[PDB]
Amino acid sequence: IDGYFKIYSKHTPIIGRDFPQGFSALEPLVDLPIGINITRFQTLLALN
Amino acid sequence: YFPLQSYGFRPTYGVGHQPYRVVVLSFELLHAPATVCGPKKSTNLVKN
Numbered sequence: 001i002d003g004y005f006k007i008y009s010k011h012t013p014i015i016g017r018d019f020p021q022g023f024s025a026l027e028p029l030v031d032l033p034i035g036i037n038i039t040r041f042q043t044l045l046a047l048n
Numbered sequence: 049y050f051p052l053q054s055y056g057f058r059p060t061y062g063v064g065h066q067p068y069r070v071v072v073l074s075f076e077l078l079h080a081p082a083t084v085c086g087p088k089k090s091t092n093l094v095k096n
């Protein structure tokens with residue numbers, strides 16, 4: 001958003017192996033009002 | 049000439065020459081969501 005960066009999340013248990021067919025809502029956790037330009041997105045991988 | 053000059057504050061000096069601590073409060077206009085507000089809370093639930 002222009003004034004906020006809303007973040008929604010949800011923790012669920014495994015039913016099956018990968019990507020089970022079912023419905024679960026995503027509860028919000030925090031809304032940081034940073035208001036900055038965001039165009040690209042990159043993730044991180046932990047290396048031990 | 050040296051740009052900086054020592055104040056040389058002394059208690060025996062007059063009020064005009066006495067040191068004065070000055071703090072300037074600058075308020076940022078609304079460009080980002082407000083992060084600083086004033087404390088306001090009173091009253092009770094008073095039900096029914």
Ligand SMILES: *[C@@H]1O[C@H](CO)[C@@H](O)[C@H](O)[C@H]1NC(C)=O
Binds near residue numbers: 036037038039
């Ligand atoms: C923020 O910067 C990005 C990257 O250049 C641009 O695509 C986007 O339009 C900009 N948004 C605003 C509101 O200036």
